[model samples]
Target: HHHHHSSGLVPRGSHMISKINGKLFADMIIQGAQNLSNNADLVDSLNVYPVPDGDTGTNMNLTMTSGREEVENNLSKNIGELGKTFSKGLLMGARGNSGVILSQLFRGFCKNIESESEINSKLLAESFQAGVETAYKAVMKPVEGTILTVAKDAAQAAIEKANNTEDCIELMEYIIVKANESLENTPNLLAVLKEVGVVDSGGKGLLCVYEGFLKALKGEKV
Candidate 1:
C-alpha cells in the first residue's frame, strides 16, 4: 500500500519483509469488519440477558468502519504504518462500552507491531496477546462469558502454536480453530448466550476477522 502524506509519499511495500501486499492486508481487515457488522444482527437476536440493548453489532461496526476510513485516508504501504493509522482511528471513533474495549484492543495490537516492517506467525501471535491484555485491562470487572474470555483463549492458543509453527498458514489455521472453540463455549459461560442459543457477538466478530486474515494470508482476493 502507498500513502500520500504531507511528510512525503510513504510506501508500505518498502517496509514489508514478507510477500504479502500491505494494501491487500488493509482490504482484508475492511472486509472482515464489514462482515462482522452484517453478522452482528444474528448475535443481537440471541441477546437475552442483556435485554437487547441493540448496540453490540452497531458499536463494533462503527469502531471498525472508523478504522477502515483511516486506512483509506492514510493508505499506508507498510503493515506497521497501517497499524498505527488504524489505532488512531479506532480510538477516535470508539462509542459505547463495547466499542471502547475494541478500540483499546486494537491500540494494544498496533503497539506490538508498529515498528515491524514484516509480520510473521510469531509476530502476529504476540500482537494478538498484546491486544488481549489491553482489552482485559480496560474492563473494570472482566467477565468470563464475554469477548474477553474468547479473545484470551484464542491468543493463548495462537502464541503456543506459533512457537512451534513458523509457517503463517499453519499458525493461522490453529488460531482459527482455537477461536471457533472459544466461540462455541461462550454460550456455556454466559446465561444470556445460553438462553439465546448463540455465541457472544464479539467473539463471533473476532472469528470473522481471523478468518478474513487467514484468507488474505493465503493470497485470496479481497
Candidate 2:
C-alpha cells in the first residue's frame, strides 16, 4: 500500500482540499492538465453535431497545457505570480474559441487572487464566479447550454457552499456536481444538444478540468 501511487484522473471518491498554498495550486494545475490531456479524445468525441466538426477537446487540452506548464515551472511562492503566469500562458497560446474562453476563465481567477498567499473556500468560490463573468463577457452571444452555463452554475453552487465551509475538497465536490448538472441540462437549454444527443462539448471540456481539480484535492499525485 505504501508503494501505491495515485492518479491525475477523475474522482473515484470525494473530499476537500484542507489547506492550500500557491505551490500546491500550481501542482494541482499540472495534474489537471494531465487529466484533461488524457481525456481529450473523449471530449472530442462528444461533438456529435454540426457535421462532427469536433475540435473542442483538443483546443481545451492544448490551452490548458501551456497554463499548466507555466505553473509547473514557476518557482515563486507568490500566488499572484503563479496565477498570472498561468493566465499569461493561456492567453498567449489560445487556439480557438474554446481556448479563448478557457483563458478568460483563468485570467479572471488570477486577478481576484492577485494578493492572496493562500486560498480558502470563500475566495475560491468568488474567484470562480469572477472567472465565469469574464468568460461570459468575452462571448458575443453567450449560450446557456455550454461551458458558460456549467461555469456559472458551478460558481453559484460554490458561492452557496462557501458560506458554510472553506474546505477546498468539499467546495470543489459541490462545484463539480453543479457543473455536471449543467452539462446534462445543456440539452434542454440548447436544442442542438438534444438533437445531437450529446451535451455541449465546451461544457464537457470545462468540467474535465474541474473534475481533475477535485481529484488533485483528494490527495493524489497532484
Candidate 3:
C-alpha cells in the first residue's frame, strides 16, 4: 500500500480492469516506474549482505524508466506497439544483474504477446508464466531467494487465479500478494538474506513495481 491513498488522478474502483489497450498499458508501466523511483530507498536497503555494492533499487529504476521513456516518446495506440517499445527500452538500457533479469522477464512477455490487440487476464497470466520460464532459463544458476523466485511464484499464482478472475486489476492483486509472500520467504531460503535480516533486494524492488501496478489498476496516480 505504499502508493495507496485517496483517489485523485483517477477515480477509485474495486471492479475488474478487464482490458488493456496500448495507451493504458503504457500508462501502467510509467506509473510503475514512478512508484519504484519514489520508494527505491526502501528496497535499496535490502542488501543481501553488508556490502556497499548493492544497486538493485537503482538498477530497476533505470530499467523501468527506460521503458517509461519509450512510452512517453511514442504514440502507440495498441499494446503490441507499446509492449515492444517497453521491452526494447529495457533491453537497451539494462544494467546490473537485477536490471538484466527484469529485461529478460519483460522480453519473454512481449515476445509472447506479439499479436494481441489488447491485454486480458488469461493473456497476462500466460505471458507472465512464459516470462518466468524464460528468465529462469536465462540464469546460469538460479537462486531461490531472488527476483526469479518472486516472479515465478507470482506468475504461477496468476495462472491459477486467472481461471477465476478475468480482470487485469484482480490478476495484479493476486500477483502482488504472491510476490510479497515470496519476498517475505527470501530470508528463510537464503543465508545471505537471513544474515542481513532483509528480503531479497531485487524481489523487494519487483514488489514495489507490483504495488504500483495494483495502484494503477485501482485508478490512482501510483
Best by TM-score: 3
lDDT, model 1 = 0.77
- The reply for model 3, stretches above 4 Å from the true place, is 1-14, 49-52
Segments of candidate 2 deviating more than 4 angstroms:
1-18, 48-51
| Candidate achieving higher lDDT, 2 or 3 | 3
Displacement of the residue 2 alpha carbon in candidate 2, Å: 43
Worst 10 residues of 3 by lDDT: 43-52
Instruction: Output the lDDT of residue 173, model 2.
Output: 86
How do the predictions measure up, each by TM-score? 0.84, 0.89, 0.90
**Which scores higher on TM-score, 1 or 3?**
3
Put down candidate 3 lDDT per residue, 1-222, tens digits, no spaces: 497688657756667688877877777787888999997777676755335476778888999898889879984777887889989999999877888899999989888887788888899899889889889998898878889999999999999999889788878987888888998998888888887688888888888877887777777886
Compared with the true structure, all predictions reach lDDT values of 0.77, 0.83, 0.84
Stretches of candidate 1 off by over 4 Å are 1-21
Global local distance difference test of model 2: 0.83
**In candidate 3, which residue pairs get closer than 3 Å at backbone N, Cα or C atoms, i.e. clash?**
none
| lDDT tens digits, residue span 1-222, model 2 | 587768768755445465567876786687788888888898888875434667888989999998887777774677777888889889988866777889999989889998878778888899999999999988888867878888899999999999998688888888988889989999998888898799988888888888788877777763
Q: Evaluate candidate 2 by giving its C-alpha RMSD to the native, one decimal.
A: 8.4
- What would you estimate as the lDDT of candidate 3? 0.84
